[PDB]
Amino acid sequence: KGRLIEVTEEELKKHNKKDDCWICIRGFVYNVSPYMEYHPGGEDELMRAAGSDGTELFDQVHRWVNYESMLKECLVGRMAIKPAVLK
Amino acid sequence: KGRLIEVTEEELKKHNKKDDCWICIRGFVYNVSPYMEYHPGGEDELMRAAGSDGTELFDQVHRWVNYESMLKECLVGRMAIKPAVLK
Ligand code: HEM
Ligand code: HEM
């Protein structure tokens, strides 16, 4: 139970510390704390997106990196949507 | 004295509550708590950037709003930089 969740922005922003770092990329939310020590660009760079939507930063440095496959085991879930999104 | 300070990432993240809400826009840090009740987009929207760098969110909704003049009385200071930034 509880493998994949809906993530509100309020929830996402709680996870803004190195040891508890969530980032949203294209609506998918990942727990990148276990990846911190491996990121080729270093920890400080990854932390620029801590607790936030990292899509723009990600796209400005390496748009084609296969994050979905690399981070699959760290997938938290998906960002919540406003009902109007579905109009 | 003490009107403008250097703001670290650690310090910025502490000011994440509605009554003590700091937002960084383009390196400038503002305590927006007094502005909460006036923001045309409402309080929830402004809270999306609480205790964080709000530049991307700000630019996604109203790039041209004159925040420097509007929020001048709320200016905390500037984000810290690493020495390497000055190379
Ligand atoms: C969202 C904030 C991120 C920032 C600011 C960032 C920044 C960087 C930077 C500066 C580099 C070195 C690029 C260069 O010197 O050309 C890099 C490399 C790399 N990063 Fe990130 N990164 C972010 C997120 C991620 C994430 C989430 C992943 C993994 C899913 C990732 C995987 C990689 C990979 C695979 C490389 C090496 C690409 C190559 O071999 O050329 N990055 N990153
Ligand atoms: C922190 C400094 C900010 C200032 C000084 C500011 C100022 C303003 C102003 C002047 C408007 C009305 C613009 C108009 O007349 O067309 C507005 C609306 C709005 N604001 Fe902000 N804002 C700030 C931050 C933010 C942030 C960070 C967000 C998003 C997280 C946001 C979300 C919105 C939204 C959604 C609207 C209504 C936009 C629309 O319906 O087109 N604001 N704000």
Curated annotation (Swiss-Prot), chains A, B:
Organ and tissue specificity: Widely expressed.
Family: Belongs to the flavoprotein pyridine nucleotide cytochrome reductase family.
The protein, known as: Cytochrome b5 reductase 4
Protein role: NADH-cytochrome b5 reductase involved in endoplasmic reticulum stress response pathway. Plays a critical role in protecting pancreatic beta-cells against oxidant stress, possibly by protecting the cell from excess buildup of reactive oxygen species (ROS). Reduces a variety of substrates in vitro, such as cytochrome c, feericyanide and methemoglobin.
Subcellular location: Endoplasmic reticulum
Binding site for heme: 39, 62
UniProt domain Cytochrome b5 heme-binding: residue ranges: 4-80
